Design a protein around this ligand. Structure first.
Ligand SMILES: Nc1nc2c(ncn2[C@@H]2O[C@H](COP(=O)(O)OP(=O)(O)NP(=O)(O)O)[C@@H](O)[C@H]2O)c(=O)[nH]1
Ligand SMILES: [Mg+2]
Ligand SMILES: [Mg+2]
Length: 164
């Protein structure tokens, strides 16, 4: 079957793992558990097509160790947290590193604003929007906790790969 090589990147603690675990294991981790590098492979049906999601869950903490997984990566979830301004700034750097490593500014990518269940927001949707719009990528807000937007985000990425 068709495989889609997805890579989840972003600053430490933004909820990259929680997002992936919600998608694959239908629950919210709700705990401290930093990632080194984890891989999930799940057979799904998206828009009637059987496919294998091969998802790489990466470290927000291993910078030269990033090139290799960006090289093979097919599409990228670029995650920040809407209560964490710094993480939104960092996500600029992730995108630039992906573009550089892959020698392309045409790599399938979704900008993800996670933790949208939290009231104490510090990153307005509008600024994330403008940034996404500027870069030619979709913007989707998620809550790994309530599952809001989680399938939207991952499936949109898959469709962005099919549309490439
Ligand atoms: N309220 C809320 N908390 C979330 C959400 N996603 C993750 N968290 C919480 O935020 C923390 C970080 O989650 P985690 O998934 O480990 O982040 P990460 O980006 O994978 N971290 P790392 O880069 O170190 O692997 C945990 O306490 C987790 O339960 C979310 O959507 N909402
Ligand atoms: Mg993690
Ligand atoms: Mg559930």
């Amino acid at each position: 079957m068709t495989e889609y090589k997805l890579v989840v990147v972003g600053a430490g603690g933004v909820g990259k793992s929680a997002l992936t675990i919600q998608l694959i294991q239908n629950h919210f981790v709700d705990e401290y558990d930093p990632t080194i590098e984890d891989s999930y492979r799940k057979q799904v049906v998206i828009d009637g097509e059987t496919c294998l999601l091969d998802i790489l869950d990466t470290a927000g903490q291993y910078s030269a160790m990033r090139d290799q997984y960006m090289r093979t990566g097919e599409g990228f979830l670029c995650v920040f947290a809407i209560n964490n301004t710094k993480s939104f700034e960092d996500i600029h750097q992730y995108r630039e590193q992906i573009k550089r490593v892959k020698d392309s500014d045409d790599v399938p990518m979704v900008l993800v604003g996670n933790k949208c269940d939290l009231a104490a927001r510090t990153v307005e949707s509008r600024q994330a929007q403008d940034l996404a719009r500027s870069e030619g990528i979709p913007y989707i807000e998620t809550s790994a906790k309530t599952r809001q937007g989680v399938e939207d985000a991952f499936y949109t990425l898959v469709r962005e790969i099919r549309q490439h």
